[PDB]
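Re: [help] complex structure
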Amino acid sequence: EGASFNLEDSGNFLCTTVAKGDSDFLKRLLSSGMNPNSEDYDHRTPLHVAASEGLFLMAKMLVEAGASVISKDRWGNSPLDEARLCGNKKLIKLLEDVKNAQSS
Amino acid sequence: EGASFNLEDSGNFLCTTVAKGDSDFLKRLLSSGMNPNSEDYDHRTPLHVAASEGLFLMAKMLVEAGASVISKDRWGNSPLDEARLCGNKKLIKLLEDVKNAQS
Amino acid sequence: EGASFNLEDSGNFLCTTVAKGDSDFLKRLLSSGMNPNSEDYDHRTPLHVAASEGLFLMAKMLVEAGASVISKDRWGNSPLDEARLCGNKKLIKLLEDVKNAQ
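Output below.
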């Protein structure tokens, strides 16, 4: 029927969901695809939160939803920067390649 | 009756509520004794959000609730430090006074 | 029923309420029909006081109500001038956007 949350701050609710860490909840949400990424009160997209948290599965799944890596938090840090800070090889490679491609 | 909040992620919900910016509604939460020390997934206190955004009044009441200002976030900046980054002289003033009390 | 505030020294009361800093009280006040365009005896709008105090959330409520950004104070200073004195860059930006719109 064309399911779409379209909730108030649904992307910010995804920031709160990455705070929850429920990858299944997130997968079903992003299957409904309410929002790819949206800045939180810290101006951090849910991709920022996942990348800083090292949640590579959630971050890759958000990138599949459309969470951009060129977005930067309140302190001008992209999710790629957070992933590089974390040091997650798979997540670092994913965000490096995706953001470098996104620049073009 | 002693009914408490018992609400999941009190810190993150407080960050969200301060983000809304309803000073009297936060005050009503405080009349229910709302969680003084709070933090979201980025370890950012609602004090952090208020100070980075310069919400001096919200931070004023929240600190009145007994909120820890020396507490820092994922970035290692306290709400005092976040206000210093934002340069809210009045908010820096209040947070510094309460910190000198706390230190 | 068409309630109107009809309260003496409305601008002065609004400046004093900005001094109170109760954002919810002012939100409900100016959303109940009161106009914050009115200034005080010092011709300072409540927007003037908010901008000098750097009360961005409070001044944003104020502007949405209709508090003039190009109105001057007793000393001939706009709320934009008050924002520049405060040092709040973002407040300066929205006040400049409003002056251009107005």
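Chain A touches chain B through 13 residues (CB under 8 Å).
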